[PDB]
């Protein structure tokens, strides 16, 4: 039972196509991910925008929805649109739509100014300008948002940034009780599967 289990799994989970070294994952003499060398390379880098944390810094505690009703006066833009685009940008990390980029530009201008004020001439700055049609942040040099990546698959991004404890998902409860459980039970409360 176990063997054909393994066979099915190894056959379905195998990769294909060409890797960064220009060869198949199954190629004879040359190998990829030696001793989880890529795993560690993700460990120390992590997937996050600079723009992401500037925003999550300036917004601070206060309600996302409140902020959205604020940053749109009545005639500005549909709230649903920039709400959607904001959600898809923060978790499920994506390139921000030029809607969200325009809003964030006229919102965060002083934090981006302060992040940009010291930099030497030949080094990468941080800029939101959509003058070019496309949003893919492999297209801007990664200088549009603060991104170091061309692409990150949504699920992994969401897992990674949620491993940072900033947002409240299981913290919906009463506040202080949530924090007391976090302190006294630790994070090791889920060691137990019961």
């Amino acid at each position: 039972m176990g063997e054909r289990m393994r066979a099915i799994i190894e056959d379905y989970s195998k990769g294909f196509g060409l890797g960064p070294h220009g060869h198949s994952p199954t190629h004879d003499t040359i190998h990829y991910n030696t001793l989880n060398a890529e795993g560690e390379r993700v460990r120390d880098l992590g997937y996050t925008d600079a723009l992401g944390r500037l925003f999550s810094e300036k917004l601070g505690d206060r309600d996302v929805h409140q902020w959205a009703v604020e940053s749109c006066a009545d005639g500005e833009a549909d709230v649903r649109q920039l709400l959607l685009s904001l959600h898809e940008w923060r978790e499920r990390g994506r390139p921000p739509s030029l809607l969200l980029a325009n809003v964030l530009s006229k919102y965060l201008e002083e934090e981006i100014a302060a992040f940009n004020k010291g930099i030497p001439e030949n080094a990468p700055k941080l800029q939101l300008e959509t003058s070019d049609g496309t949003l893919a942040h492999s297209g801007s040099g990664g200088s549009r948002s603060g991104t170091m990546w061309a692409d990150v698959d949504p699920t992994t991004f969401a897992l990674h940034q949620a491993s940072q404890s900033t947002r409240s998902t299981r913290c919906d409860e009463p506040f202080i009780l949530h924090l007391v459980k976090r302190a006294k039970l630790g994070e090791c409360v889920t060691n137990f599967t019961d």
Partner: peptide
């Protein structure tokens, strides 16, 4: 104390 048990915390 009821508050300290029921309060949410952003405002």
């Amino acid at each position: 104390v009821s508050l300290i048990l029921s309060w949410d915390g952003p405002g």
